[PDB]
Amino acid sequence: LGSMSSIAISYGEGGSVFCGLKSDGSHLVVCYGSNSAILYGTPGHLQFIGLTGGDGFMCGLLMLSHQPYCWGNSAFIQMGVPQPMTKGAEYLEVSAGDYHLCGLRKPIISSSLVDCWGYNMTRNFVFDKQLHSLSAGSEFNCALSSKDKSVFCWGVISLIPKEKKFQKIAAGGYHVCGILDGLESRVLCWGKDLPPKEPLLAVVGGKFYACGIKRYDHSAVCWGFFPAPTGIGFYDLAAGNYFTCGVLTGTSMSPVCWGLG
């Protein structure tokens, strides 16, 4: 689920895995969790600029080739660089849902070309707007318009006024939460506990819940159908289906994670 990030979560019957880019700045990935396919399949030497996880697989945007690269074991998508792939094709972003991956094709922060792979979404989309900030749900994918900061989703989908300006979005299972543009940076959530009024720095989406980091005290807060550790200050969050992980620092340790749903 969700957007490309320095941290990502894989979930499902195969097990739960958290992967992050090393803090030494090497752009190498380290993974922790119960999905042995993902854990032992983690590239030790391949460099990544972003990560995104789904059901049974972790994916990353390769730093050199700028192509999506997935590892693990999924019955719905293929691992490695996903086919069909155009030779020499470069991507700006990747977002992984449950059983699908979408890549923002590089034609440079934006593009109108989005390639998706997986169950009932192996499609080459050509949109009429410049898009960035890809974020994947269970059965949909979203992005922000580069021109007017409006949210656009495809793949029914709940409609939001185009006047709503967002600086960040985080797709969950069957909802999207967006941090509105401006100093207030208040969260707005829509789709198929009430969200906090306080300014948020980050937001993530689980299957039936969302979590965010409050700007003032960097404290985690969660809300939805499916709470959070209160005394901790995280610098980033990642969400799977039914659990969230936060990072305090880049010291050699397993991640701080909690279940909710």
From Swiss-Prot:
- sequence repeats: from-to residues: 9-44, 48-83, 101-129, 131-158, 166-192, 200-229, 234-261
Let me know which tissues express this protein, per UniProt. Answer: Expressed in seedlings, floral buds, siliques, leaves, shoot apical meristems (SAM), and, to a lower extent, in roots.
Describe how expression is induced or repressed: By CLE40 in root quiescent center (QC).
The protein's PTM annotation reads:
Autophosphorylated and phosphorylated by ALE2.
- Which stretches of this protein does UniProt put in the Extracellular compartment? 1-261
Which residues of this chain are annotated as glycosylation sites?
Answer: N120
What the record says about disrupting the gene is:
Reduced fertility due to abnormal embryogenesis and integument formation. Abnormal seed coat and leaves epidermis, with transient fusion between adjacent developing leaves and reduced hydrophobicity of leaf surfaces. Decreased numbers of giant cells in sepal epidermis of acr4-24.
Which region ranges are annotated with the description 7 X 36 AA repeats?
A: 9-261
Which subcellular locations apply to this protein? Cell membrane; Endosome, Multivesicular body membrane
Binding partners and assembly: Homodimer. Interacts with PP2A3.
**What family classification does the UniProt entry report for this protein?**
Belongs to the protein kinase superfamily. Ser/Thr protein kinase family.
Query: What's this chain's function?
Result: Controls formative cell division in meristems, including root tips and lateral root initiation zones of the pericycle, in response to CLE40 signal. Acts with CLE40p peptide as a ligand-receptor pair in a signal transduction pathway, coordinating movement of the root tip and organization of cell divisions in the root meristem. Required during embryogenesis and development, probably for the differentiation of protoderm and epidermal cells. Involved in the regulation of cellular organization during the development of sepal margins and ovule integument outgrowth and promotes giant cell formation.
- This one is known as Serine/threonine-protein kinase-like protein ACR4
Species, as recorded: Arabidopsis thaliana
